[PDB]
Design an enzyme around this catalytic site. Structure first.
Site, mmCIF file in Angstrom:
data_model
loop_
_atom_site.group_PDB
_atom_site.id
_atom_site.type_symbol
_atom_site.label_atom_id
_atom_site.label_comp_id
_atom_site.label_asym_id
_atom_site.label_seq_id
_atom_site.Cartn_x
_atom_site.Cartn_y
_atom_site.Cartn_z
ATOM 1 N N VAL A 229 7.111 -0.113 5.647
ATOM 2 C CA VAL A 229 6.102 -0.590 4.583
ATOM 3 C C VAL A 229 4.844 -0.996 5.427
ATOM 4 O O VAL A 229 4.808 -1.627 6.418
ATOM 5 C CB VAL A 229 6.801 -1.825 3.915
ATOM 6 N N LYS B 108 0.871 -2.894 8.998
ATOM 7 C CA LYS B 108 2.205 -2.332 9.017
ATOM 8 C C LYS B 108 3.455 -3.314 9.300
ATOM 9 O O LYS B 108 2.875 -4.067 10.449
ATOM 10 C CB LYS B 108 2.254 -1.228 10.148
ATOM 11 N N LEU C 10 0.823 -1.250 -0.002
ATOM 12 C CA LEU C 10 -0.111 -0.027 0.198
ATOM 13 C C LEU C 10 0.833 1.215 -0.101
ATOM 14 O O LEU C 10 0.322 2.188 -0.664
ATOM 15 C CB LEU C 10 -1.014 -0.012 1.284
ATOM 16 N N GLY C 11 2.013 1.199 0.445
ATOM 17 C CA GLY C 11 2.894 2.299 0.471
ATOM 18 C C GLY C 11 3.931 2.483 1.594
ATOM 19 O O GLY C 11 4.027 1.174 2.258
ATOM 20 N N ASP D 289 -1.364 14.674 15.556
ATOM 21 C CA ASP D 289 -1.080 14.794 14.256
ATOM 22 C C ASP D 289 -2.276 14.871 13.208
ATOM 23 O O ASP D 289 -2.252 14.072 12.403
ATOM 24 C CB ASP D 289 0.002 14.081 13.783
HETATM 25 C C1 3OV Z 1 2.694 8.664 13.490
HETATM 26 N N1 3OV Z 1 1.605 8.897 12.327
HETATM 27 C C2 3OV Z 1 1.061 10.227 12.302
HETATM 28 C C3 3OV Z 1 1.832 8.145 11.371
HETATM 29 C C4 3OV Z 1 2.100 6.782 11.609
HETATM 30 C C5 3OV Z 1 2.072 5.975 10.401
HETATM 31 F F1 3OV Z 1 2.354 4.560 10.563
HETATM 32 C C6 3OV Z 1 1.642 6.241 9.103
HETATM 33 C C7 3OV Z 1 1.320 5.381 7.964
HETATM 34 O O1 3OV Z 1 1.544 3.880 8.044
HETATM 35 N N2 3OV Z 1 0.717 5.464 7.017
HETATM 36 C C8 3OV Z 1 0.481 4.925 5.755
HETATM 37 C C9 3OV Z 1 1.455 4.174 5.146
HETATM 38 C C10 3OV Z 1 1.036 3.651 3.928
HETATM 39 C C11 3OV Z 1 -0.066 3.052 3.971
HETATM 40 C C12 3OV Z 1 -1.128 3.450 4.965
HETATM 41 C C13 3OV Z 1 -2.647 2.830 4.737
HETATM 42 C C14 3OV Z 1 -3.274 2.792 3.428
HETATM 43 C C15 3OV Z 1 -4.575 2.182 3.490
HETATM 44 N N3 3OV Z 1 -5.263 2.022 2.270
HETATM 45 C C16 3OV Z 1 -4.896 2.557 1.123
HETATM 46 C C17 3OV Z 1 -5.781 1.806 -0.196
HETATM 47 C C18 3OV Z 1 -5.551 2.111 -1.402
HETATM 48 C C19 3OV Z 1 -4.191 2.480 -1.816
HETATM 49 C C20 3OV Z 1 -3.925 3.117 -3.171
HETATM 50 O O2 3OV Z 1 -4.790 3.633 -3.667
HETATM 51 N N4 3OV Z 1 -2.824 2.435 -3.613
HETATM 52 C C21 3OV Z 1 -2.500 2.823 -5.090
HETATM 53 C C22 3OV Z 1 -1.039 2.994 -5.208
HETATM 54 O O3 3OV Z 1 -0.032 1.894 -4.835
HETATM 55 C C23 3OV Z 1 -0.389 1.794 -3.409
HETATM 56 C C24 3OV Z 1 -1.721 1.832 -2.699
HETATM 57 C C25 3OV Z 1 -3.513 3.179 -0.680
HETATM 58 N N5 3OV Z 1 -3.655 2.926 0.462
HETATM 59 C C26 3OV Z 1 -4.981 1.816 4.444
HETATM 60 O O4 3OV Z 1 -6.266 1.298 4.513
HETATM 61 N N6 3OV Z 1 -4.323 1.784 5.825
HETATM 62 C C27 3OV Z 1 -5.261 1.455 6.909
HETATM 63 C C28 3OV Z 1 -3.114 2.425 5.915
HETATM 64 C C29 3OV Z 1 -0.663 4.448 5.851
HETATM 65 C C30 3OV Z 1 -1.842 4.941 6.838
HETATM 66 O O5 3OV Z 1 -1.680 4.135 8.041
HETATM 67 C C31 3OV Z 1 0.553 6.953 6.929
HETATM 68 C C32 3OV Z 1 0.736 7.850 7.800
HETATM 69 C C33 3OV Z 1 1.177 7.442 8.977
HETATM 70 C C34 3OV Z 1 1.295 8.437 10.172
#
Ligand code: 3OV
Length: 263
Positions: free
Chosen positions: A20, A35, A13-14, A126
């Site tokens: 990751v 995560k 997902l990213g 945040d």
């Molecule tokens: C300390 N703080 C403020 C934090 C701690 C974190 F761990 C995080 C963190 O993991 N992330 C994070 C990082 C990655 C993912 C998620 C993340 C992404 C989701 N969903 C999606 C769905 C679709 C797509 C999508 O469209 N694509 C197309 C392109 O190719 C990839 C997927 C992306 N994400 C999702 O459901 N969760 C629960 C988490 C999240 C959110 O969780 C972001 C902020 C963040 C902030």
């Protein structure tokens, strides 16, 4: 504690603060995000103890923590899956061609989640559109609440760091490290601004250093074109110079419901 045998990893997902994040299935049925906590990114033992508290946070507008896998490294954090990804990117896609009633409903989704956190005396720290997610029904939920406390990267947690959320922080956070319910309120008003601006960067023509000065002078974000006077009053109320004059999330929710009825 989730058993890792009940997880299947399916697509990436990213990458976020802890490395990751993958999409997968739990118990061969349930969509989840997982995560994989990158070594050196997290204060792991402190998180593991807090995970208990965070699992008891259950509200339909909070991204649900389902469990953790901690009897291994890397640790896993298993959460609800939100098919439409991050709210910031969602707001920036012109194809959605949102009605303002849809924008106000996104604010209400977030305000409901934050009223619930406030009732539990639990700070996000945040809150911002980048830290909200959107599900397959277009419902916005608040994500990663409380996790800032476990981030080891000083560029994120120091007020003078390059990654610190300057543009979502009240003056008392930036000047004095005064965190409270009222610093999440301030951030909520900036999030409403982000929603009504369709994902513009707050203070888009200023740097972080200039934004801190502008707000210490009493000046504020301008009314986004799509916001009525009443919607602007709500977001602007979150930015009072005196923290104790800012509303609670309960009052904000009542104000949002009133505008939905009026407009
Ligand atoms: C300390 N703080 C403020 C934090 C701690 C974190 F761990 C995080 C963190 O993991 N992330 C994070 C990082 C990655 C993912 C998620 C993340 C992404 C989701 N969903 C999606 C769905 C679709 C797509 C999508 O469209 N694509 C197309 C392109 O190719 C990839 C997927 C992306 N994400 C999702 O459901 N969760 C629960 C988490 C999240 C959110 O969780 C972001 C902020 C963040 C902030």
């Amino acid at each position: 504690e989730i058993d890792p045998k009940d997880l299947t990893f399916l697509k990436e997902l990213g990458t976020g603060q802890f490395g990751v994040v993958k999409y997968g299935k739990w118990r061969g049925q349930y969509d989840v995000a997982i995560k994989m906590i990158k070594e050196g990114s997290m204060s792991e033992d402190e998180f593991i103890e807090e995970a208990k508290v965070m699992m008891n946070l259950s509200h339909e507008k909070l991204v649900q923590l389902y469990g953790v896998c901690t009897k291994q490294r890397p640790i896993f954090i298993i959460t609800e899956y939100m098919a439409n990804g991050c709210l910031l990117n969602y707001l920036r896609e012109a194809r959605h061609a949102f009605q303002t009633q849809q924008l106000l409903e996104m604010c209400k989704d977030v305000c409901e989640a934050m009223e619930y956190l406030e009732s539990k005396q639990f700070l996000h720290r945040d809150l911002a559109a980048r830290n909200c997610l959107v599900n397959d029904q277009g419902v916005v939920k608040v994500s990663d609440f409380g996790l800032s406390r476990y981030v080891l990267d000083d560029e994120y947690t120091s007020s003078v760091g390059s990654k610190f959320p300057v543009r979502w922080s009240p003056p008392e956070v930036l000047m004095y490290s005064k965190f409270s319910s009222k610093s999440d309120i301030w951030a909520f008003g900036v999030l409403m601004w982000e929603i009504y601006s369709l994902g513009k960067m707050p203070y888009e023509r200023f740097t972080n250093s200039e934004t801190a000065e502008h707000i210490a002078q009493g000046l504020r974000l301008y009314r986004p074109h799509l916001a009525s006077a009443a919607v602007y009053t709500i977001m602007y109320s979150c930015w009072h110079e005196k923290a104790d004059e800012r509303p609670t999330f309960k009052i904000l929710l009542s104000n949002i419901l009133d505008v939905m009825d009026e407009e």
